[PDB]
Design an enzyme around this catalytic site. Structure first.
Site, PDB file in Angstrom:
ATOM      1  N   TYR A 163       0.852  -1.208   0.000  1.00  0.00           N
ATOM      2  CA  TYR A 163       0.000   0.000   0.000  1.00  0.00           C
ATOM      3  C   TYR A 163       0.887   1.258   0.000  1.00  0.00           C
ATOM      4  O   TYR A 163       0.675   2.100  -0.806  1.00  0.00           O
ATOM      5  CB  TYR A 163      -0.985  -0.070   1.152  1.00  0.00           C
ATOM      6  CG  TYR A 163      -1.869   1.128   1.295  1.00  0.00           C
ATOM      7  CD1 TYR A 163      -3.014   1.245   0.546  1.00  0.00           C
ATOM      8  CD2 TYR A 163      -1.524   2.156   2.144  1.00  0.00           C
ATOM      9  CE1 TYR A 163      -3.833   2.334   0.671  1.00  0.00           C
ATOM     10  CE2 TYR A 163      -2.336   3.253   2.291  1.00  0.00           C
ATOM     11  CZ  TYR A 163      -3.484   3.355   1.529  1.00  0.00           C
ATOM     12  OH  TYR A 163      -4.293   4.406   1.639  1.00  0.00           O
ATOM     13  N   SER A 164       1.883   1.283   0.868  1.00  0.00           N
ATOM     14  CA  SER A 164       2.880   2.367   0.998  1.00  0.00           C
ATOM     15  C   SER A 164       3.597   2.589  -0.347  1.00  0.00           C
ATOM     16  O   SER A 164       3.739   3.720  -0.727  1.00  0.00           O
ATOM     17  CB  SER A 164       3.840   2.086   2.095  1.00  0.00           C
ATOM     18  OG  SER A 164       3.268   2.256   3.344  1.00  0.00           O
TER      19      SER A 164
END
Length: 248
Positions: free
Chosen positions: A157-158
């Site tokens: 996600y990051s």
């Protein structure tokens, strides 16, 4: 309260059926914008159109933003529903599963990337081509504080939010000589929190100086300024919504 005029303007909001997309849509309708919701669920899309109908002109296009061809289909459909494509708020995406890198499912890694990163690229490509032809555009890619910080146990996600941010900078600089603004927002955590444990909520709140999550209406307020005509100089820029967490 402020008033953001969007009279004559038409907006695409991906992930428009709920959450940030939905809050943004309600705010854009309040300023006379013509709104087209893009989402993967026809049923959620129906619920949204019914609720916002007292607020104004809303349309629905069902699409998987992780599918380039469905995105091409979505854009052609929008053209038949609109006089022009003035605004994009790319809010669609998935949080992804939490796991250290050592135990991350490559399958889940590919999925989070495909939806959170490649999809934003597909959506930004078809929309900006119309903004280029009009010499008018205001885009906001909703990223996350994870894009700036590299949040532990959320590498996928990051990484996708980071890619979305660098995509924002490339696109902004590419369209700087035209009347087109390409900006990104980095919110902190804003139904998703029901999955979190109380211990997790207190860890997340420890990281936020505000000591609370951002309200969807607060995100909508900032996005409405960013998609407004008045945001005429700033491009390829990250706007923060982290309640003091971000140090850049």
């Amino acid at each position: 309260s402020n008033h953001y005029d969007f009279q004559g303007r038409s907006a695409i909001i991906t992930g428009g059926a709920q959450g940030f997309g939905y809050a943004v849509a309600e705010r854009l309708l309040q300023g006379k914008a013509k709104v087209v919701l893009w989402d993967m669920d026809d049923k959620a899309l129906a619920e949204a159109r019914a609720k916002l109908e007292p607020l104004g002109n809303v349309e629905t296009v069902r699409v998987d933003i992780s599918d380039q061809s469905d995105v091409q289909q979505a854009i052609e459909a929008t053209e038949k529903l609109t006089q022009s494509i003035d605004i994009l708020v790319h809010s669609a995406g998935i949080a992804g599963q939490n796991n250290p890198v050592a135990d991350y499912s490559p399958e889940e890694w590919r999925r989070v990337i495909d939806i959170d990163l490649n999809g934003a690229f597909y959506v930004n490509q078809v929309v900006v081509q119309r903004m280029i032809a009009q010499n008018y555009g205001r885009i906001v890619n909703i990223a996350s504080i994870a894009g700036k910080e590299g949040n532990p146990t959320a590498s996928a996600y990051s990484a996708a939010k980071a890619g979305m941010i660098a995509l924002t900078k490339s696109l902004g600089k590419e369209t700087a000589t035209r009347n087109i603004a390409v900006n990104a927002i980095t919110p902190a955590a804003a139904r998703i929190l029901e999955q979190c444990t109380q211990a997790h909520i207190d860890y997340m709140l420890s990281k936020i100086p505000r000591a609370r999550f951002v309200k969807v209406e607060e995100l909508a307020a900032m996005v409405a300024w960013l998609v407004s005509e008045e945001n005429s100089f700033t491009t390829a820029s990250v706007f923060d919504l982290s309640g003091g967490r971000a140090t850049y």
